[PDB]
Amino acid sequence: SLAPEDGSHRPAAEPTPPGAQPTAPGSLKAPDTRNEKLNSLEDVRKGSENYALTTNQGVRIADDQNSLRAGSRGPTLLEDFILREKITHFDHERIPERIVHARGSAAHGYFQPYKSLSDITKADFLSDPNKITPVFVRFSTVQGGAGSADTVRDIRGFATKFYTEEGIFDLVGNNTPIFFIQDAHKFPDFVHAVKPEPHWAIPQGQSAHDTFWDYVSLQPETLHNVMWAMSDRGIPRSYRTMEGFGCHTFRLINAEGKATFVRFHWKPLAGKASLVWDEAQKLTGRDPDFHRRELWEAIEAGDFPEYELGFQLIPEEDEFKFDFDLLDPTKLIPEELVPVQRVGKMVLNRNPDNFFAENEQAAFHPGHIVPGLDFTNDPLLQGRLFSYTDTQISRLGGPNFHEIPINRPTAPYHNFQRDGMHRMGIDTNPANYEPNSINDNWPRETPPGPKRGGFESYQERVEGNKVRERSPSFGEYYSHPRLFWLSQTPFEQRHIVDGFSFELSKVVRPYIRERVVDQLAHIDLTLAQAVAKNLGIELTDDQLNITPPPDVNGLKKDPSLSLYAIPDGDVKGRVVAILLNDEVRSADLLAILKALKAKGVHAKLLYSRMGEVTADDGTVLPIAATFAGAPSLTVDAVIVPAGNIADIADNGDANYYLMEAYKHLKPIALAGDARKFKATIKIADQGEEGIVEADSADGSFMDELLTLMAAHRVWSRIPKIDKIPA
Amino acid sequence: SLAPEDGSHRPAAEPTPPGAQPTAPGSLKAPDTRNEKLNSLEDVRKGSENYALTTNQGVRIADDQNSLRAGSRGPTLLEDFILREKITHFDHERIPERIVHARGSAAHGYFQPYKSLSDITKADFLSDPNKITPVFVRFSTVQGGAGSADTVRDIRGFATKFYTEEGIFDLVGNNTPIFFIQDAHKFPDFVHAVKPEPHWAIPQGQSAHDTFWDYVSLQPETLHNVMWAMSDRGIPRSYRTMEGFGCHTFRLINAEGKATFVRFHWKPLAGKASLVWDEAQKLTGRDPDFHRRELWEAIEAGDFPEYELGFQLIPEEDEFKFDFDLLDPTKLIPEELVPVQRVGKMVLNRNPDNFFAENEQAAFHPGHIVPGLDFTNDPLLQGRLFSYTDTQISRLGGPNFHEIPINRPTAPYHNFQRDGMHRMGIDTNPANYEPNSINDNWPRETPPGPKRGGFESYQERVEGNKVRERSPSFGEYYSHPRLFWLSQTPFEQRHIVDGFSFELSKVVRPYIRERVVDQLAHIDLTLAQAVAKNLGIELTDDQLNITPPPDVNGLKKDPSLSLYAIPDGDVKGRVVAILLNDEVRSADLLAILKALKAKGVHAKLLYSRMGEVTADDGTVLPIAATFAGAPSLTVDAVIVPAGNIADIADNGDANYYLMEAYKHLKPIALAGDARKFKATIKIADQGEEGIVEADSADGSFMDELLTLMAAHRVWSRIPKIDKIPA
Ligand code: HDE
Ligand code: HDE
Ligand SMILES: [S]
Ligand SMILES: [S]
């Protein structure tokens, strides 16, 4: 017995806030959270308590501390089969990482539609509001390895595996509504350009290098998703606070055989929020696991990630009614033109048990559709259909990857396929071919029908010659970048300029920077000039006269493209740093902690050391982390209670905590004599918007703080930080 | 879509300083640099200029921009074999990363001994000072994935493949002289404990989490290598400025058959230097590729990494003469007791061409020895011999990994092994077995002897029963951690305390912290008290009375265990940031660059934007990076020349640049009105050791700065940095 007698090694099996208890496997943290998929995995879940340690062959091990040797200082013997099994398994633990989206964090949950969608699709999962579909979702970055950092500037993946009664449906989306390239044939060129360069394998998790910008400069189709990546969209606060999109026009197919074009949306019910660049970059160093950690802890805390599934629906007859081609994956469909219709709600409510087994081996692929859905001729989507099945053969070791437990359908599956590496299912069918008489032709084909029918493709008319040719309709590259730019707030536009400027400054060959600047001048002159100024580049008279691209169907902005133009803030699940001193005013802390609790906002009590401090009234205050150990990067706001301020007033880390949080536009609240820290961040006596201050933490001090937090960051402070040395 | 007319896309094929040219494949950067191994790879090197783009079958491609489809807006066709080859290759790019040391950076070079070692070993590569052996070296961290960051706190790997005339010898070392554990049977337990925890796969690149410290608290054998990891040895400045060690006692065997025990050492000719934790951690965010980059650039610049091979030699009759067991890999052999004998010099002078082909697929293994070397019964080394061959079967896809070009011996290899996946060699031998008459028994066994003989094991006597039992002589855990502790300077001790304090503060379960502090009390009470204080823990009376472990064979300290106690600075290949203004005083810059150049010290010119600024005399100065884009983390010292100081005096980034450099103990030099920045870092008029200042940058000013840089950091400043908010 090595566990502590007080049982403090084991986390409570109840929802607890971030940092209160060690984290655990989902079935141990939340044993009563169930769904049909989680239940169906019970056959392979393996426990441990009270069991004897064995080899894989079930042989009990007596000494797991020593190899077998001739004499206690002698050579190890080949007949040590316990040593060799154990080391063999270790020696083969690793499998190939995903070619792209290798870095990803995942969770189980469930989806339910708001109402039946039978008028527009025969998809069984969308047929009845009382139909619950288990999901498994993996969020990811794109470029970096499985051991790269979470808060890089990159697109994010948002993949949802729906375990439906009529088969697996994978909705394999991203956090922007378009992609960099038009045709799947170029995907290796694009990916190679953004990935670490091949001579030296640098840089990790970054597009800020020559080959990416070289490619972008020579392939203007990429400019739209580049605008998105350079904006604060490229640096989300949390997977809970970004949008999701299905990237392509697909089809819905109803029982009557009518096709409707659809683009898929996920709206984050926690709101849209992003970091700022300096914060995101520094955070890759201070906690490269920050998003994986935040997702896991939100789920353990009961702050379940929730998203609303939405559809943009376009009738068959309206295929050609836009300025852009619906099948072009570099074009978005503005919500002002085609609204998103609410469809249903997904809640992620349980972490996995074993990350490797459930997360690393999960296979998602957009060809996994079900009756009631179908594809289109989008030439990016068309190639994806090839890639996601082929790649599993090396990644997951062969064609039986659907038998890896997380991948298994909960719907029945029976067919005539046999064998392959790792074959688990033992087929008893006397036949392995059809048609057969020896088993009366079972399992049998099923006609298409309104429910429970076989899959049949929509009979779309095809007419043309066999060509390798880009549609002329796809040859417009600047209008959507422009629409995106004009839709952003002035502070968002500033962060876009700064992303381009920062990234191009890492491009070693100056001609590439110049070429990119030329492309910016084809989108918007103010943008092009601002980036040019940061790069010491002067636009030519010609570049000054490039006429801007047309409006998109008469639109000059669409506010749904902004993260922040329309408020959607939610504070629940956010976190506040509380900077302790050695004699805190206990009435300030009561008021602070209860107000945060009442709104679902977490707190972490920080100090210059671990252990405890004692408040004015003798209350013993447990310390979560030190100032340097849990930097302001990791919180949404900072509160300093009154008390013995002289304890920390000269602590460099405590001052720096506030400068860093100030620079990154976070709300800061100072009570009583904590107002002496005003001088550290240079705040005028009469105060400033975004700094909450009062004699004490009572009255409106906490409501004012929470109002700031609902608006995420203090954008008005941007001109003030510009000269802060932090 | 083509190269600029000025040819600026292509790096000069001459040595150039970091940042002067884009980096490039080694064979293009330094085509005249050769050795036998580099030449032998010519069969597989593939160029590209003037060649047609083809499928892998040699078919020229007409349109690499589009998929084949039925009409230009139609579905992609299955007969597009060009698309599917290209996509299939992409979909299968990744192979499993190494189970440990997945993150690593490699280069080519050569080794030669100083004199013949034939009195002690018959190894051919140590037999003649004029016999040059090609080497390929990979440096690594241990815990993190291939996409994790470089400047983590971790042990570093240092693996050298010697391509000798009598076979490949791989010396597979680390940058500390011991390991965490005693018996290879426990390697998977230790590695699992340090690696990301299995439920959520956090943390990456960090031992700062509950499972690692749980293991350490329960296995006091780990404490010696933990001491080393918590010291600044865990955060080297560069692979060029760390020591390497072979980890085990091996044997040398001479022609007469005499065995001598040996431990291997690499001495960095650029001297020993490490980061400080705050700097190392922030650098994982600002440049996760810093060590990989610095190595590649040092080789491009001609600052070739050089190491001296050294041997500790112990006669067979002295096996039992120390108070520790020679075969215990948790124990070091103090250089005060057994001096390192200089053996030869290794120079790394070319970067690879393709990181995947040469670095990622290289396989090193300590069982790859040659006649003249042999093993011992070290029970860690014993188990390693199983693992390094076994693991290659999944990692490199089969038993023909020696045919992968980087791995191939330059010495002849012929034997009766056949087949296996991706078999390259076509054997013509009528026989695939021996003995055979049908090929007159070729290839044939060769007797052992003085040179070019067959391998025979040294006939060590073995006497004991078949037991799984740890040698009693291995059961001492505290004396070597204490010797290490006592050998460190006071500032190195403070950093060790701070490493333990920071790490244990991230351990969520407090009892684990308490148990680690109790272990520390068995090593040194001063260390234990100082960690406990930081964790808010009070030592008990029993803990205060624990008797310190005994001295190691009479030693109270051994200064060769310290990074810094004995000066060994070398400034060549270091780098200074030079903070520009818009009217630099050219006279200052001229003298600065001249003094730096004379000592092989590089410079980076930084400003608040990219492009150019013009000096007082018309000199146009190109800007390498912005103050934010290349932070003081990345340089060794900072110089601010005179001129129009008002231009940058109020710049937040420029002021911060100095604050960060000051905090991290780096030399700072301020000329003319740049002395105004003294106010940002609180230097009194009188000045301060480690801040160089004068009316202008002259002979005297540069000499002082260069003197400080030879001592690496300004340790005496440590008391002054607590207060700086940076
Ligand atoms: C719409 C969102 C989107 C788009 C447009 C693309 N990816 Fe993804 N991807 C793979 C291939 C692939 C191709 C061929 C194309 C355009 C032709 C895209 N991508 C663009 C893949 C290599 O087959 C992939 C890697 C491993 C795997 O199983 O499939 C793959 C990954 C991926 C993910 C991660 C899913 C997961 O396992 O967590 C996501 C969210 C996307 N892609 C989105 C996506
Ligand atoms: C003393 C230097 C040292 C020590 C003591 C060990 N490693 Fe290493 N290691 C593998 C297995 C293994 C075992 C079983 C033990 C102790 C029993 C050690 N290690 C401790 C490996 C799985 O075979 C390995 C991973 C991938 C691979 O090809 O080999 C491996 C790697 C490794 C490297 C990396 C070499 C490289 O590719 O650059 C180094 C420097 C060590 N180990 C050193 C080492
Ligand atoms: S997409
Ligand atoms: S070792």
Domain B24-409 fold is Catalase HpII,  Chain A, domain 1 (2.40.180)
| Residue among B490, B540, B35, B488 nearest B227 (CA) | B488
CA distances from A325 to A87, A182, A320, A321 (A): 56, 11, 7, 9
CA atoms of B535 and B491, how far apart (whole Å): 20
DSSP A641: -
Q: DSSP labels for B628-692?
A: TTS-GGG-SEEEE--B-THHHHT-HHHHHHHHHHHHTT--EEEEGGGGGGGGTTT--TT-BTTEE
d(CA B115, CA B121) in angstroms, rounded, equals: 12
Same fold, A24-409 and A573-726: no
| Ordered DSSP codes for A416-461 | S----TT-------S-SSSS-TTTTT-S------SSSPPP------
Chain B residues within an 8 Å CB radius of A98: 94
CA of B142 to the centre of ligand 2 (A): 9
State the smallest CA–CA distance between residue B102 and chain A in angstroms.
10
d(CA B186, CA A64): 8
- Contact predicate B255/B121, CB 8 Å: no
Residues A485/A496, Cβ–Cβ less than 8 Å: yes
Task: Categorise residue B536: left if φ over 0, alpha if ψ from -120 to 50, beta otherwise.
Answer: left
Taking the C-alpha atoms of residue B165 and residue B125, their distance in angstroms, rounded to an integer, is: 7
Task: Give me the amino acid identity at A581.
Answer: N
DSSP conformation class of A236: B
Query: Which residues lie below 8 Å from residue A543, measured CB to CB, with a gap of 6+?
Result: A517, A518, A521, A528
Q: Does B66 touch chain A (CB under 8 A)?
A: yes
* Residue B715 in contact with partner chain A when CB distance is under 8 A: no
Alpha carbons B458 and B475: distance in angstroms, whole number:
28
Pair of tokens at residue B533:
């204080």
Residues 364-423 of B with CB under 8 A from A: 377, 379, 382-383, 386-387, 390-391, 393-395
Q: How far is the CA of B249 from the centre of ligand 4 (A)?
A: 9
Ligand 2 center to residue B409 CA distance, Å? 20
C-alpha angle A164/A425/B97, rounded to 5°?
Answer: 85
CA angle B605, B239, B146 (to 5 degrees): 100
Q: Which residue of B has its CA nearest to A76?
A: B382
Which among A367, A327, A387, A330 is positioned nearest to A185, based on CA atoms? A387
| CA-based max dimension of chain A | 91
- Which tokens hold the place of A201? 């394998």
Where do we find the tokens 């004991």? B464
What lies within 8 Å, CB to CB, of B542 at 6+ separation is none
B125 is written with which tokens? 């590569």
Dihedral pair phi/psi, residue B689, rounded to 5°: -60, 125
- The helix, strand and coil proportions of chain B, stated in percent and rounded to the nearest 5, come to 30, 15, 50
Burial of A356 (0-12, 13-18, 19+ CB in 10 A): middle
Please report which ligand is nearest the Cα atom of B379: 2
Catalytic hit among B101, B224, B365, B522? B101
The length of chain B, given as a count of residues: 726
Q: How far is CA A613 from the centre of its chain?
A: 38
Q: Is B542 exposed, middle or buried (0-12, 13-18, 19+ CB in 10 A)?
A: exposed
Q: Strands B133-140, B104-113: parallel, antiparallel or unpaired by DSSP?
A: antiparallel
Contacts of residue A306, defined as CB under 8 A and 6 or more positions apart, other chains included, come to: A268, A269, A270, A345, A346, A347, A348
Amino acid of residue B43: D
Chain-centre distance of CA B643, in angstroms? 40
Residue B612 DSSP class: E
Neighbouring residues of A517: CB distance < 8 A, sequence distance ≥ 6: A504, A528, A531, A532, A535, A537, A539, A543
For residue A720 the two structure tokens come to 């003030």
Cα→Cα distances B234→A62, B7, B153, B694, Å: 36, 43, 5, 37
The β-bridge partners of B266 are: B244, B309
Q: Where are the alpha helices (DSSP H) in A535-567?
A: 541-544
Task: Give yes or no for a contact between B486 and B562, defined as CB atoms under 8 angstroms apart.
Answer: no
Distance in angstroms (rounded) separating the CA atoms of residues A534 and B418 = 62
DSSP A24-60: --HHHH-TT---HHHHHTTTT----TTPPPB-TTSPB
- Considering CB atoms only, which of B88, B99, B187 is closest to A94? B99
CB-nearest partner of A23 from B1, B186, B199 = B199
Q: Are A73 and B324 in contact (CB under 8 A)?
A: no
Residue nearest to atom 1 of ligand 3 (CA): A247
Q: Supply the Cα-derived Rg of chain B in whole angstroms.
A: 28
DSSP, residue by residue, A333-377: --TTTSPEEEEEEEEEEE--S-IIIIIIT----TT---TTEE---
Residues B35, B108, B174, B359: which is the catalytic one?
B174
The verdict on a CB contact (< 8 Å) between B71 and A96 is no
Tokens 């007469």, residue located = B256
Measured on CA atoms in the order A316, A318, A319, A325, is the torsion positive or negative? Answer: negative
CA distance A160 to A139: 9
Task: Kindly state the helix (H) or strand (E) to which residue A313 belongs, with its residue range.
Answer: strand A306-315
Which residues neighbour A102 within 8 Å (Cβ) at sequence distance 6 or greater? A140, A144, A145, A146, A148, B94, B147
Pairing assessment for the beta strands A602-607 and A625-626 based on DSSP bridges: parallel
Q: Output DSSP code: residue B364.
A: -
- The whole-angstrom distance between residue A99's C-alpha and the CA centroid of its chain comes to 17
- Do residues B721 and B668 make contact, with C-beta atoms less than 8 angstroms apart? no
Minimal CA–CA distance to A456: which of A443, A445, A464? A445
Ligand 2 within 6 A of CB of B98: yes
Alpha helices per DSSP H over B365-461: 379-390, 392-395
Helix B479-487 × helix B223-230 angle, to 10°: 20
Please name every residue paired with A245 in a beta bridge, in sequence order, or none if there are none: A174, A265
- Assigned token pair, A535: 């790069």
For residues B346 and B112, what is the distance between their CA atoms, to the nearest angstrom?
7
Tell me, yes or no, if A101 is annotated catalytic: yes
In angstroms, the CA A498 to CA A479 distance is 21
**Token reading at A701:** 């001090």
The CA distance from B303 to B285, in Å, is 26
Mutation to test the B interface, candidates A2, A5, A46, A66, most B Cβ within 10 Å: A66
Q: In the 8-state DSSP scheme, what is residue B546?
A: P
Query: Is the separation of the CB atoms in A263 and A249 below 8 Å?
Result: yes
The answer to whether the Cα torsion of A521, A526, A532, A538 is positive or negative is positive
The token duo for A34 is 């169930």
Whole-angstrom CA distances from A678 to A25, A135, A670, A675, B65 are: 44, 48, 8, 5, 59
* C-beta of B364 in contact with ligand 2 (< 6 A): yes
Please, what is the Cα angle at B696 between B694 and B698, to 5 degrees?
A: 95
DSSP letter, residue B588: H
Angle ∠(A599,A604,A610) on CA atoms, nearest 5: 160
Output phi, psi for B229, to 5 deg: -65, -40
Task: Give DSSP secondary structure letters for B128-193.
Answer: -TT--EEEEEEEE-SSS-TTS-SSSSS--EEEEEEEETTEEEEEEEESSSS-S-S-GGGHHHHHHH
Distances from the Cα of A246 to the Cα of A158, A178, A380, A590, B468, angstroms:
9, 9, 12, 46, 58
Question: Separation of B395 CA from ligand 2 center, angstroms?
Answer: 13
Residue A559 C-alpha, separation from nearest chain B C-alpha, in angstroms: 31
Q: Report how far residue A472's alpha carbon sits from residue A325's, in angstroms, rounded to the nearest whole number.
A: 10
DSSP conformational letter for B355: I
**Atom 32 of ligand 1 has which residue's CA nearest to it?**
A101
Domain limits, chain B: 24-409, 469-572, 573-726
CA distance A65 to A325: 66
β B69-70/A466-467 pair status: antiparallel
Structurally, at CATH architecture level, domain B573-726 sits in 3-Layer(aba) Sandwich (3.40)
Asked if residue B100 has its Cβ within 6 Å of ligand 2, the reply is yes
Beta bridge mates, B576 = B603, B637
Q: How far is the CA of A100 from the centre of ligand 1 (A)?
A: 7
How far apart (Å, rounded) are the C-alpha atoms in residues B568 and B600? 16
- Asked whether A616 and A585 are in contact (CB, 8 A), the reply is yes
Residue B144 at interface with chain A, using a CB cutoff of 8 Å: yes
Helices (H), A563-673: 586-599, 652-663
DSSP-assigned states of every residue in B250-290: EEEE-TT--EEEEEEEEEETT---B--HHHHHHHHHH-TTH
Is the peptide bond prior to B443 cis by the omega test (within 30 degrees of 0)? yes
Nearest Cα to Cα of residue A406 among A145, A138, A104: A138
Structure tokens at A226: 């580049």
Distance CA A182, CA B65 (A): 10
| Cβ(A162)–Cβ(A132) below 8 Å | no
Total count of residues recorded for chain A: 726
Q: Comparing C-alpha atoms, which of A539, A507, A537, A549 is closest to residue A220?
A: A549
d(CA A561, CA A243): 10
Binding residue positions of B for heme = 388
At residue A622's C-alpha, the angle toward residues A617 and A626, to 5°, is: 120
Strand partners, B135: B109, B162
The catalytic position among A35, A174, A400, A655 is A174
What are the chain A neighbours of B91 within 8 Å (beta carbons)?
99, 387, 390-391, 394
Closest CA to A143 of A242, A61, A212: A212
Enter the tokens of residue B395: 């990692």
First to last CA, chain B: 46
Q: Are A161 and A404 in contact (CB under 8 A)?
A: no
Q: Which two tokens stand for residue A601?
A: 């906002």
What whole-number distance in Å separates Cα of residue A606 and Cα of residue A578?
6
What distances in angstroms separate CA B506 from CA A19, A22, B190, one per listed residue? 10, 11, 19
- Any B CB within 8 A of A87 CB: yes
Determine how many CB atoms are found less than 10 A away from the CB of residue A91.
Answer: 22
User: What is the Cα A195 distance to its own chain's centre?
Assistant: 19
Annotation says B522 is catalytic = no
Q: What are phi and psi of A549, to 5 degrees?
A: -70, 165
Nearest-angstrom CA–CA distance, B615 and B643: 8
- After which residues do gaps appear in chain A, with C to N over 2.5 Å? none
Chain B nearest C-alpha distance from A600 (Å)? 22
Helix (H, G, I), strand (E, B) or coil at B587: helix
Binding-site positions of B read: 388
> Residues B32, B37, B42, B44: is their CA dihedral positive or negative?
negative
Q: Is the CB of B344 under 6 A from ligand 4?
A: no
Q: How far apart are CA A106 and CA B199, in angstroms?
A: 11
Token output for B36:
């036998």
Q: What's at A219, amino acid-wise?
A: Q
Residues of A in contact with B296 (CB under 8 A): 200, 202
Measured by CA distance, the residue closest to atom 1 of ligand 4 is B247
CB atoms within 10 A of CB A403: 16
What is the spatial distance between Cα B607 and Cα B611, in angstroms, rounded to a whole number? 9
Task: Give the helix ranges, DSSP H, for A47-116.
Answer: 81-91
Enumerate residues 6+ apart whose C-beta is below 8 A from B528.
B517, B520, B521, B539, B543
Is B366's C-beta closer than 6 angstroms to any atom of ligand 4?
Answer: no
Q: How far apart are CA A362 and CA A108, in angstroms?
A: 12
> Rounded CA gap, A357 and A355, in Å?
6
Three-state SS at A708: helix
Cβ atoms of A246 and A373 closer than 8 Å:
no
Q: Specify the fold of A469-572.
A: Hemocyanin, N-terminal domain (1.20.1370)
User: Which of residues 320 through 339 in chain A touch B, CB cutoff 8 A?
Assistant: 325, 327
Which neighbouring-strand residues pair with B578?
Answer: B605, B639
Grouping H, G, I as helix, E, B as strand and the rest as coil, residue A482 is: helix
